[PDB]
């Protein structure tokens, strides 16, 4: 699975809390990407590993 | 000059495949590159003629025109050895093709896409995932009518078709497979033929209509049998003109150049000029025309 | 006999060698067969509908619309940049 | 007013050798060369694994021999070296004047830098085919962390 | 393109100046160079 | 040098790069001054302390 | 000559418009205004001091 979302807000909350982010918020979803490569993401300065 | 390609396999060729390739020794194979050592994935005609897509033969004709040709002389384990075909050398080509056309007249041969079917010349390698298809070698009098059947099936899909689907020979009739759609490049050749015809229809002469009219009403040749004793009206309304020689002479010069251009368009695929064919040895000493 | 230029590392009881033929291929300007390609397939859905008993698990995010009727219609993904 | 040539330089091609590199640790070079002479590319081994003599009355612990056949991979390694014909025309022409002696030495040096090119190309093609053999029979580690 | 090809006595240095050469000549790090492949790679006629 | 390949590819023959490097020219110059009163004494001979 | 300088270009938008399905991804920012009818007129940036 790739890093998919349903709104920009779940994207902005994925970087804010990597552990306590909600995969579902009422109708929207966010699909955290797993892969053989752990691609590192940077949105401004909030990095996730 | 060493003219010898050693096409090498990755995996081991099984014994039944060795027997099937030893059954085909001396046949034409087209190569991808002209160099001394190659790989199997790229040997033959299978890269343009695949099982997944429609049989389009006009791109196979231009592939056989562009890439080099080689004969198969030695097949062994893990490797099969080929001999290239260059101008200036005489090569022995045996008739191992499944719709058998006898080369009695020693006519010039022609290298064809496998229009008669894949599965008789499909010869299959279960060592590596590749399919070697051998191009059909056959004389050009059969080749022109096979190419015209290919070109005519696409225009007679709309409007008896078993005569166009099969081939005609002196001894036998063989079934050659036609697709429902020719393809992009076959449609391009049919488009170029349509533009040539729709331009050249106005540059037709007027005098030969008077010949066919007086010959229909006067003397039936064996060649005049197609009309079934009937003339259309277009002949009449182009025979409401008087005949001169100057415009007809310029029209016949441009007709000469247009018939030369049509000779350029129909001549597709390689041709081999045979000399001293041996019917008892079943091989033929040939060179590239 | 002769010394062989090969850095030998000790992994437990075996003393294996570590040789790089990168200099052998860079003097050809040919690619080294250990810089391989790896193509994984990435799949993601777009436009799904979460079933009508609906929930959240985050008291931080507050959208200004009706929570019962909201459909994903796009899927914001990320690039390699 | 002159035009200085500040020196003139060429590179020394390093002589790689398959028995000098450590890729030949994983290969034993047999001096037999009969598997090139042999018609079939197979060799049959009568291997015999041991067995644990079991005691319960389940099944008799029959001996284990395996008649395994290892097919040999024959690879063909070929380069080419386009060499000019007016180098051959000086190679056969005996030189007498010192300018044609220098030109003939140059022709020999051009020829001896093509035979050396061929030998240096077949000691890199050998390492390339050996390394591609060891990368064709190399299953990945995410399989053989468990299959092994 | 500004280069002569004469049968010079070329001094044989030991530098590793083959590394990234066929790609560096393509982009144009060298202002003037001659590529001699095949029969042109010869110590030329005097 | 070139690797001999067994797969059918267009093989590069014996290549030879002839790259030349042209020299540069850097011409530097400062400008110093000298009073003519400091030269009319330099080109004389004194008989006085 | 080893006290050189840089030319980094800094770009920032002034007075954009957030689209209509408005969200937020934080608590503890409570404004006494209408969140649906919100528009930036400025862009507060930070000096080098």
Reduce the secondary structure of chain B to three states and give it as a string: CCCCEEEECCCCCCHHHHHHHHCCCCCEEECCCCCCEEECCCCCCCCCCCCCCCCCCHHHHHHHHHCCEEEEEEEECCEEEEEECCCCCCEEEECCCCCCCCCCCCCCEEEECCCCCCCCCCCEECCCCEECCCCEEEEHHHHHHHHHHHHHHCCCCCCCHHHHHECCCCCCCCECCCCCCCCHHHHHHHHHHHHHHHHHCCCCCCHHHHHHHHHHHHCCCCHHHCCCCCCCCHHHHHCCCCCCCHHHHHHHHHHHHHHHHHHHHHCCCCEEEEEEECCCCCEEEEEEC
CB contact under 8 A, F10 and B33: yes
Residue E35, chain F, CB below 8 Å: the answer is yes
Q: In chain C, which residues touch G (CB < 8 A)?
A: 59-65
What technique solved it?
A: cryo-EM
CB contact under 8 A, D127 and C4: no
- The continuous run of DSSP H or E covering D84 comes out as none
- The continuous run of DSSP H or E covering D78 comes out as none
C-alpha–C-alpha distance, residues C78 and A11, integer Å: 9
**φ and ψ at E2, to 5 degrees?**
125, 15
- Asked whether A9 and A3 are in contact (CB, 8 A), the reply is no
**φ and ψ at C60, to 5 degrees?**
-100, -30
Decide: helix, strand or coil at residue D99. Answer: helix
C-alpha–C-alpha distance, residues C24 and D130, integer Å: 14
- The continuous run of DSSP H or E covering D72 comes out as none
What Å resolution does this PDB entry report? 3.8
Strands B69-76 and B109-112: unpaired
Q: How many Cβ atoms sit within 10 Å of the Cβ of residue D116?
A: 15
Q: How many Cβ atoms sit within 10 Å of the Cβ of residue B129?
A: 8
D95 to each of D92, D98, D105, E8, how far by Cα in Å? 9, 8, 10, 19
Q: In chain E, which residues touch C (CB < 8 A)?
A: 16, 18-23
Chain A residues with CB-CB distance to G24 below 8 A:
9
C-alpha–C-alpha distance, residues D92 and G22, integer Å: 89
**φ and ψ at B75, to 5 degrees?**
-125, 130
Decide: helix, strand or coil at residue A46. Answer: strand
Decide: helix, strand or coil at residue D111. Answer: helix
Q: Name the neighbours of A, counting chains with at least 3 Cβ pairs within 8 A.
A: C, G
**φ and ψ at B164, to 5 degrees?**
-80, -25
* Tokens 């001996």 found at: D63
Best mutation target, G19, G25, G37, to test chain C (most C CBs within 10 A): G25
C-alpha–C-alpha distance, residues G38 and G31, integer Å: 11
**φ and ψ at D73, to 5 degrees?**
-95, 115
C-alpha–C-alpha distance, residues D139 and E4, integer Å: 52
| Burial class of residue B96, CB neighbours in 10 A (0-12, 13-18, 19+) | middle
C-alpha–C-alpha distance, residues D29 and D26, integer Å: 10
User: What's the sign of the alpha-carbon dihedral B193, B199, B201, B204?
Assistant: negative
C-alpha–C-alpha distance, residues C64 and B142, integer Å: 77
Sequence-separated (6 or more) residues with CB below 8 Å from residue G41: G15
Residue A18, chain C, CB below 8 Å: the answer is no
Reduce the secondary structure of E3-46 to three states and give it as a string: CCCCCCCCEEECCCCCCCCCCHHHHCCCCCEEECCCCCCCCCCC
Which among A27, F22, F7, F25 is positioned nearest to B9, based on CA atoms? F7
Alpha carbon dihedral B82, B85, B90, B95, in 10-degree steps, equals: 60
Both ends of chain C: CA-CA distance in Å? 53
C-alpha–C-alpha distance, residues B84 and B67, integer Å: 11
C-alpha–C-alpha distance, residues B68 and B35, integer Å: 10
Here the tokens at position G39 are 């528009």
C-alpha–C-alpha distance, residues B97 and B121, integer Å: 8
- Asked whether B177 and B116 are in contact (CB, 8 A), the reply is yes
| Burial class of residue F46, CB neighbours in 10 A (0-12, 13-18, 19+) | exposed
Residue D3, chain E, CB below 8 Å: the answer is no
Nearest chain C residue to D23 by CA distance is C19
CB contact under 8 A, E38 and F19: no
DSSP string, C14-79: EEEEE---HHHHHTTT---TTS-----------S----SS-----SS---SS-SSS----------
Chain F residues with CB-CB distance to B82 below 8 A:
none
Q: What distance in Å separates residue C1's CA from the closest CA in chain F?
A: 28
* Tokens 């006999």 found at: C1
- Asked whether A4 and C75 are in contact (CB, 8 A), the reply is yes
Number of CB pairs, chain B paired with chain F, less than 8 A apart: 19
Nearest to F20 among E2, E25, E40 (CB): E2
- Asked whether D133 and D73 are in contact (CB, 8 A), the reply is yes
Chain B residues with CB-CB distance to D80 below 8 A:
35-36
Q: What distance in Å separates residue C80's CA from the closest CA in chain G?
A: 22
Q: Where are the alpha helices (DSSP H) in A1-49?
A: 8-16
- Strands, DSSP E only, in chain F? 17-19
Chain G residues with CB-CB distance to A5 below 8 A:
none
Nearest to C64 among G25, G26, G35 (CB): G35
Here the tokens at position D138 are 């190399």
Q: What distance in Å separates residue E17's CA from the closest CA in chain D?
A: 7
Q: How many helices (H) and strands (E) does chain F have?
A: 1, 1
| Burial class of residue B268, CB neighbours in 10 A (0-12, 13-18, 19+) | buried
Q: How many Cβ atoms sit within 10 Å of the Cβ of residue F6?
A: 19
**φ and ψ at B210, to 5 degrees?**
-65, -35
| Burial class of residue D125, CB neighbours in 10 A (0-12, 13-18, 19+) | buried
């Amino acid at each position: 699975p790739a890093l998919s979302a349903s709104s920009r807000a779940l994207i902005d909350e994925f970087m804010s809390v990597k552990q306590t982010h909600a995969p579902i918020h009422y109708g929207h979803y966010i699909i955290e990407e797993v892969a053989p490569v752990r691609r590192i993401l940077k949105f401004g300065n909030k990095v996730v590993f | 000059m060493d003219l010898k390609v050693v096409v090498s396999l990755s995996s081991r060729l099984y014994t039944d495949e060795i027997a099937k390739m030893q059954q085909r020794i001396g046949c034409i194979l087209p190569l991808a590159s002209t160099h001394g050592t190659q790989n199997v994935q790229g040997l033959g005609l299978g890269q343009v003629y695949s099982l997944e897509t429609v049989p389009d033969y006009v791109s196979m004709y231009n592939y056989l025109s562009d890439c080099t040709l080689a004969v198969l002389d030695e097949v062994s384990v893990d490797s099969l050895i080929l001999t290239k075909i260059v101008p200036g050398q005489t090569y022995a080509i045996k008739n191992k093709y499944q719709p058998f056309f006898q080369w009695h007249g020693t006519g010039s041969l022609s290298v064809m896409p496998p229009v008669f079917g894949r599965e008789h010349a499909t010869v299959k390698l279960e060592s590596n995932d590749v399919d070697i298809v051998f191009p059909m070698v056959l004389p050009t009098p059969i080749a022109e009518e096979v190419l015209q059947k290919i070109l005519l099936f696409n225009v007679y899909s709309r409007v008896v078709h078993m005569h166009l689907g099969s081939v005609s020979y002196l001894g036998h009739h063989y079934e050659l497979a036609l697709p429902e759609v020719p393809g992009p490049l076959g449609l391009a050749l049919l488009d170029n033929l349509s533009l040539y015809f729709c331009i050249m229809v106005t540059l037709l002469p007027r005098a030969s209509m008077r010949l066919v009219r007086g010959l229909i009403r006067h003397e039936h040749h064996d060649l005049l049998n197609l009309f079934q004793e009937m003339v259309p009206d277009e002949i009449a309304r182009i025979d409401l003109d008087d005949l001169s020689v100057a415009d007809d002479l310029s029209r016949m010069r441009v007709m000469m150049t247009y018939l030369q251009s049509l000779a350029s368009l129909f001549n597709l695929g390689p041709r081999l000029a045979t000399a001293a064919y041996s019917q008892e040895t079943l091989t033929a000493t040939c060179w590239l025309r | 006999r002769v010394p062989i230029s090969a850095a030998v590392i000790k992994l437990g009881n075996h003393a294996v060698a570590v040789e790089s033929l990168q200099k052998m291929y860079n003097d050809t300007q040919s690619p080294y067969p250990l810089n391989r390609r790896m193509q994984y397939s990435y799949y993601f859905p777009v436009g799904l509908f979460m079933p009508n008993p609906k929930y959240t698990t985050s008291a931080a995010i507050k959208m200004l619309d009706n929570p019962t009727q909201q459909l994903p219609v796009e899927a914001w993904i990320v690039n390699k940049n | 007013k002159f035009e200085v040539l500040l020196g003139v330089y060429t590179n020394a091609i390093q002589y790689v050798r398959f028995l000098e590199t450590a890729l030949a640790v994983s290969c034993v070079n047999t001096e037999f060369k009969d598997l090139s002479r042999m018609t079939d590319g197979k060799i049959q081994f009568r291997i015999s694994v041991p067995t644990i003599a079991h005691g319960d009355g389940r099944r008799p612990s029959k001996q284990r021999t395996f008649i395994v056949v290892k097919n040999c991979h024959k690879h063909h390694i070929s380069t080419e070296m386009e060499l000019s014909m007016l180098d051959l025309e000086i190679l056969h022409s005996i030189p007498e004047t010192p300018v044609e002696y220098a030109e003939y030495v140059g022709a020999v040096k051009t020829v001896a830098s093509a035979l050396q090119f061929g030998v240096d190309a077949l000691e890199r093609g050998l390492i390339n085919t050996v390394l591609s053999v060891k990368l064709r029979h190399a299953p990945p580690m995410f399989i053989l962390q468990t299959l092994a | 393109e500004g280069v002569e090809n004469r049968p010079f006595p070329y001094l044989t240095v030991d530098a590793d100046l083959l590394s990234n050469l066929r790609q560096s000549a393509a982009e144009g790090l060298f202002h003037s160079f001659d590529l001699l492949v095949g029969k042109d790679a010869r110590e030329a006629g005097i």
